[PDB]
Chain A
Amino acid sequence: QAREEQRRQALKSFISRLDDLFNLPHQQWLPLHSGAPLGALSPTNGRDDALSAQEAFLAACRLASTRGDFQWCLQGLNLLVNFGRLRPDWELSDRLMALSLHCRRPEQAEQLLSAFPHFLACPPSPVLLFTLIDEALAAGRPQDVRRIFATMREQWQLALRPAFYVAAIRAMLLLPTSADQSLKEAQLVAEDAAALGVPLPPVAHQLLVERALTLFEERLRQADLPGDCYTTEELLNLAQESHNRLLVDQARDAVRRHISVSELFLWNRAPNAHLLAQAAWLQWAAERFAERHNADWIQLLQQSCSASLQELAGGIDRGSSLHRGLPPALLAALIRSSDAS
């Protein structure tokens, strides 16, 4: 009964008792502030010697760890507001957000983000907002992370972050929809990340999008489907476009992160070979006809044949992307073309 009796009794009394206090005149109410400053016996005396209204309410909120007590805490909050004894601050917004979470009430948490700026000064902590995104993913509901992202983005108060853009992308590709439908929605968020201040996503962003891009329809259209497309132009065009976006982004990222027959691999210093994997893809054609349609990679793939890059005797990359290759795009691709041939 240590977790049931001693827990409910302590919280019930604290709020009940507090209510009665307010009934007395203002002369018997708790001070707003902790204490007087130095301006108003050693300097350590005073300052922090009295219990504030705010401090008492937040102290009793540490007892909740169930859904039943979550409602109870709200009761106390209202009292302060109605009596004009609440001072919004950074701390206030932080604990409130977290209190819902600790009570196993994710539903209520989301509501806060759309109702904080109406009655509060400071926004919640960035950490908290990010953590709630993973909550939905663990339960298996990737469709509930689209509305939360938009509200944050639209809001001006909250500072824009590059990291925040990663979560969104990752969650959309896991939706339980068709291959073409899932990718189409993901591209919309990507696009949005290039207009408003031309944000630069991390280096490990373009890789993910590109992985599935040239695998879900491109690869599929030349393996079993053309047995003896409707957006073939867009798929190919977007493939290369993605790559381009990465180049521009990565170059500008290094300047602010840490204030840094024909070939061009003779006097090019020692760059990272990790990126050459995606750029080494051979362009077959726009259409099925690979011989009569299009007339415009070995030398590119000669840098790493045995799956051994110039890592041990080359340069060092900071916060690089996945080192691994394309199992579902390289291993099963070349073999088929050869073995079957």
Chain B
Amino acid sequence: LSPREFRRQSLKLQRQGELFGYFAGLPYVSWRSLLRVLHLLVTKPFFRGQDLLALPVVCKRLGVSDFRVVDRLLAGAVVRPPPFSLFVASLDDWPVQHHPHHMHAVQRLLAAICANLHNYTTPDLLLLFDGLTALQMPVEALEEFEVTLGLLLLQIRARLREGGESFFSSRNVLKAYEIVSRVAGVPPECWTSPFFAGARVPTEGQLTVQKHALAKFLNTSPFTCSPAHAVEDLLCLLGSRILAERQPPRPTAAAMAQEILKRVASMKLPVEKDGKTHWSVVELALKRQMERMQRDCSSLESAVEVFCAADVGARLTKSLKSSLFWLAELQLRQATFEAGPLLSDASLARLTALTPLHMSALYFQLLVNELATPVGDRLLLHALRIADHVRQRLDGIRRQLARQCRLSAAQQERVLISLPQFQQYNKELVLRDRHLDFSPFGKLFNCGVRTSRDVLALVKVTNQHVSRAMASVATLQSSVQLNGLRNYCRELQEVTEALARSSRRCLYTAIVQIPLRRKTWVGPCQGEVEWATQQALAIMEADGAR
């Protein structure tokens, strides 16, 4: 499917619900192609097929980033006449530009919904409310998230008591309860704030939109929710258990979310311009013998339950008779990840508390933490594992990178001689992935490495583990102060410190000896998209204006 015919039948493909499928296809996506797609992206953003779910991912990789474009797309789904849970989870790793207030992706949904809070019906209320269920930003953009969540409840309460035929069914009551229950239990402190206490008919810029809703709601009600509004929510449900079409609504939604200012362009890559268009003690031995039978069978997710069941029963039986009258299984760990691992997930955590190179680092941090609470766990596993890791680091990637990516001697005596020779042989100085052999990297206690990115990817994982472990050792050194302790501190500090600092050094080398810039042949670029974006926007207000 060449791009020429793709644009001709673009309109038809949208209707069928299969638009993005052919886009992530053949190469040759120029401005011509980009523009065409963008044209329809802001004219009538209505999706019914699977394109809805695959929209966010394409945008991420594309380059398109605008406050207007982004906003318009989201508003298409908001309006009402696959699961919703999936859609919201996709709203991550998508910064928003040209916006001094909301820069992330999670703030879009909190604005759209809130704005149109007054144009919802009871059946659909539950739909939006289902976002708390599992399948946002770390700390930032969190006050807004919980503030808007409480507003939903307000509407629900008011709407439910309107005098029930649909949600009062035998099956709908159970569904509703599931969601409600999740909220109740830990009322956030944000509810008990002056923002909600303002029942009597300078605010932050982030809550500009949220503040607007309150004013409206209160006026049409004839009330606030300051405290943890509960009981009433549950009491109502207890009685039933113990006994142009869609075109008009969009632009108003964007207008309400629109800021006072037109466009606050803090950062602009291209040149500043403007484009326009013209259209009694017997049971003890009966269960204690069932502890060593699983060792051979388990040498996984189901085998762990056998050991836990036997361990608790061995201790409880003897406890009753104790105050009435008056293990070396860790050795097997040296032959599962130290001699060739295969499919070892994070489950090793549970198989450590008395029960590639990244895998070994995990165990290092866990063993040191438990010991912090002399020959059998220090000079046998703790000190032996460090020798293997250090051996594969000095002569591993550290040195490898220094021989393949560094400048060769050939070039020294070929180019780096005179000035005139620099203007003809400059082409040979370039370094690419293609020119770099990944074979040496595949034997580092593992082809699992294809690109340069993979090499770098396997660096930050190992340094993270050791970095955390160093803090635990340091804390113990400054805590035991307030002659047997000297042996357990002098040797532990000199050995632990050698790996913490040395490992960090590797990162420095790995970050510098890598290809400069370069990208995969996909399509448009950030420079091209930026100009296209503005043209795609101004185009809409030319045709429809006449």
Contact = CB atoms under 8 A, between A and B. Distances in A.
Interface of A: 6, 9-10, 13-14, 17, 20-21, 28, 30, 34, 37-39, 43-44, 47-51, 54-56, 58-59, 61-63, 91, 94-95, 98-99, 101-102, 121, 127, 131, 134-135, 137-138, 159-162, 170, 173-174, 179, 197-200, 208, 248, 251-252, 255-256, 258-260, 306, 308, 311-313, 322-325, 327-328
A20 B311 CA distance: 77
6 contacts: A131-B507, A174-B474, A179-B482, A256-B142, A306-B315, A308-B315
Contacts of A49: 427
A63 B518 contact: no
Nearest to A127: B460
B136 A38 contact: no
A197 B28 contact: no
A137 B467 CA distance: 11
A122 to B, nearest CB: 10
Q: Which 9 residue pairs are nearest across A and B when measured between Cβ atoms? A: A251-B186, A312-B308, A102-B508, A324-B373, A259-B134, A13-B416, A174-B478, A51-B426, A55-B516
Given A134-B504, A312-B312, A62 B406 contact: yes
Interface in B496-546: 497, 500-501, 504-505, 507-509, 511-513, 516-518, 521, 525, 528
Given A43-B521, A55-B430, A160-B140, A134 B511 contact: no
A179 B479 CA distance: 11
A55 B517 CA distance: 8
B265 interface: no
B139 interface: yes
A312 B311 contact: yes
A259 to B, nearest CB: 5
Contacts of B500: 134, 138
Interface in B152-175: none
Contact of B405 (A13, A62, A127, A134): A62
Contact of A328 (B146, B188, B406, B482): B482
Nearest to A162: B139
A135 B339 CA distance: 33
B511 A95 contact: yes
B116 to A, nearest CB: 24
Contacts of A324: 372-373
Nearest to A252: B188
A157 to B, nearest CB: 11
A103 to B, nearest CB: 9
Given A174-B475, A200-B139, 19 more contacts: A6-B409, A13-B416, A39-B31, A43-B28, A51-B429, A98-B508, A160-B139, A170-B474, A179-B482, A197-B143, A251-B186, A256-B142, A306-B315, A313-B309, A313-B312, A323-B353, A324-B373, A327-B373, A328-B482
Residue of A20, A44, A59, A135 with most chain B CB atoms under a 10 A cut-off = A59
B412 interface: yes
Contacts of B27: 43
A215 to B, nearest CB: 8
Contact of B478 (A121, A173, A248): A173
B308 A94 contact: no
B121 interface: no
Contact of B412 (A10, A62, A328): A10
Given A99-B512, A159-B140, A312-B311, A258 B134 contact: yes
A317 B142 CA distance: 23
B110 to A, nearest CB: 13
B447 interface: no
B517 A34 contact: yes
A313 B460 contact: no
B183 to A, nearest CB: 10
A134 B467 contact: yes
Given A99-B512, A170-B475, A328-B479, A59 B140 contact: no
B407 interface: yes
B284 interface: no
Contacts of B409: 6
B471 interface: yes
Interface string B303-324: 0000011011001000100000
Contacts of B315: 306, 308
Contact of A17 (B308, B405, B419, B518): B419
Residue of B30, B426, B501, B511 with most chain A CB atoms under a 10 A cut-off = B511
Contact of B512 (A37, A102, A121, A251): A102
B400 to A, nearest CB: 14
Nearest to A122: B267
A13 B507 CA distance: 28
A94 B511 contact: yes
B431 interface: yes
Given A14-B416, A51-B429, A134-B504, A37 B422 contact: no
A170 B471 CA distance: 8
B245 interface: no
Nearest to A259: B134
Interface in B126-153: 132-136, 138-140, 142-143, 145-146
A200 B143 CA distance: 12
A17 B512 CA distance: 22
Interface in B92-148: 132-136, 138-140, 142-143, 145-146
B507 A199 contact: no
B40 interface: no
B470 interface: yes
Contacts of A21: 419, 422
Nearest to B416: A13
Contacts of B283: none
Nearest to B136: A256
Contacts of B139: 160-162, 197, 199-200
B423 interface: yes
A231 B422 CA distance: 74
Interface string B218-234: 00000000000000000
Contacts of A138: 470, 497, 500-501
